[PDB]
Every structure is written in structure tokens, then in C-alpha cells.
Amino acid sequence: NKIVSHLLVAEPEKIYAMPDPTVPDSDIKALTTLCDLADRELVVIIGWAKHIPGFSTLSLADQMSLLQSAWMEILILGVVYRSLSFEDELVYADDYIMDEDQSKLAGLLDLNNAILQLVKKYKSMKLEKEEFVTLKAIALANSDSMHIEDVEAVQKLQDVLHEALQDYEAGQHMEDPRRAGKMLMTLPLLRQTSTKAVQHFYNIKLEGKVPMHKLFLEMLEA
Ligand SMILES: CC(C)(c1ccc(O)cc1)c1ccc(O)cc1
Ligand code: NA
């Protein structure tokens, strides 16, 4: 499938978390580091989305609405995929892999465990990079924003991305005629974990103890 191959080459380069070596470890350092990483990823995600067929033709508003509703799912799918060959560890970046203890002192035990639940299921399904990038695009198009202007156009985008997944699976996984649907059935857990993550960091935002940059702040306040 061409769309899949296109998404593959449009995949952005890895990013480093770069936790400050002079700062003492604490929940504030972890959260600050993670949100800092996320801010930089959002910049790249925005650029990445321009490569998705038909995305740049939507109105700026609709493009923004889709992103404001899907940003967390995209960010989470990323750490999920990066962590597939690991055990009980989340690879936020090559230089930032969180084990159970780290999640604990960062107050992210329940959230990271949900992310690990996502990882568990994808490991069992043997999620391929081709499927990961297509799911990321589908997640963006199917984000369910409450403010979409051109419903049909967004539906059209969802349809083209779904067709790519179906096409890919029909030609690459003939042994399982229902693999495309299984992939789609993983989206609910992604959506569920993201809704909680957004609520969690929104609260962290209110507490005011963790500095956050412009873009991250913009998505979170959406
Ligand atoms: C949004 C968040 C700061 C993040 C940062 C970077 C990333 O690649 C993916 C997600 C995050 C959400 C939930 C979570 O449990 C840990 C980190
Ligand atoms: Na979605």
C-alpha cells in the first residue's frame, strides 16, 4: 500500500529527552523532563501531519481541532511502539526509559501501567512499524473533535486511512482476514488512556509546580 509506505518515509527522527544532569532526581524533574520532551515532539507531530494525504487541504481550524483532540494518543502510541522490545519498561526516549520504580516517584504508576497494558496487547499482536504509523494517522483523523467544521472532509480522511490499513492487511496478512479490525479494536484503550493522561497533566498544570512550554500548554488547555 502506497499510503503506508508514504507514512513510513514521513516518520520523524528520534528525539532525546535530555534530563538535566545537574538536577536532583525528583517527581518534578521527571514530570518536567517528560513534558519538555512532549513539547518538542508536538512540534514534529505537526510537521508530520502535513504529509498525511488530504490533511493539509482541510481548513487550518479543522487541522488544529484534529490535533488538539488527538495529540495525546499520538504521543502515547509513540512511547508504546518504542517500548515493544522491552519488558515492563517505557521508552520515552533512548535516554529516558522508565521502570516501575520511576513511574512510582513520578506519580505515574497507574498511567504508565495502562500504557504498559497497551504495549502488552501490541506485543501479542506483533504490531509492525507499518501498522503503527497507520494507526497514528487513523488516531489523528478519528479523534472525535467536538468542533469540526467540515464533517464530510474529516470522514473522507478517516476513510482513506482505514482503506490503507485494510489494503495493507489484506495483502500482508492473508493468514488472518480480520487483522485490520483487530488493529482498529485497539484504539479504544488508546483513547481511554489518553483521556486520563490529559486529565492528569491538566491537574499537574493547575498545581503549578511543573513548568510547561507554550505548545504543550496550548494542547493541554484545548
Ligand atoms: C504526555 C506525556 C508527558 C508524554 C511525553 C512524551 C511521549 O513520547 C509520550 C507522552 C506522558 C503522558 C502519560 C504518562 O503516563 C507519561 C508521560
Ligand atoms: Na482517535
Q: Of all protein residues, whose CA lies closest to atom 17 belonging to ligand 1?
A: 34
Asked if residues 88 and 116 have their Cβ atoms less than 8 Å apart, the reply is yes
Any atom of ligand 1 within 6 Å of the Cβ of 116: no
Rounding to the nearest 10 degrees, give the CA dihedral for residues 53, 65, 127, 14. 80
3-state secondary structure the chain: CHHHHHHHHHCCCCCCCCCCCCCCCCHHHHHHHHHHHHHHHHHHHHHHHCCCCCCCCCCHHHHHHHHHHHHHHHHHHHHHHHCCCCCCCEEEECCEEECHHHHHHCCCHHHHHHHHHHHHHHHHHCCCHHHHHHHHHHHHHCCCCCCCCCHHHHHHHHHHHHHHHHHHHHHHCCCCCCHHHHHHCCHHHHHHHHHHHHHHHHHHHHHCCCCCCHHHHHHHCC
| CB contact burial 132-162 (16+ within 10 A = b; e otherwise) | bbbbbbbbbbbbebeebeeeeebeebbeebb
Q: How many structural domains are present in the chain?
A: 1
Any atom of ligand 1 within 6 Å of the Cβ of 219: no
User: Quick one: cell of 141?
Assistant: 483523523
CA 20 – ligand 2 centroid, Å: 33
Asked if residues 44 and 15 have their Cβ atoms less than 8 Å apart, the reply is yes
User: Quick one: cell of 114?
Assistant: 495502562
For this experimental structure, what is the resolution in angstroms?
Answer: 2.1
Q: Whole-angstrom Cα distance, residue 168 to residue 6?
A: 12
User: Quick one: cell of 206?
Assistant: 493547575
CA 34 – ligand 1 centroid, Å: 6
Q: What is the CATH number of the domain that holds 99?
A: 1.10.565.10
Q: Whole-angstrom Cα distance, residue 83 to residue 77?
A: 10
Any atom of ligand 1 within 6 Å of the Cβ of 38: yes
| Crossing angle (nearest 10°) for helices 60-82 and 129-141 | 150
Q: Is 163 left (phi over 0), alpha (psi -120 to 50) or beta?
A: alpha
- Expressed as residue numbers, the domain containing 204 is 1-222
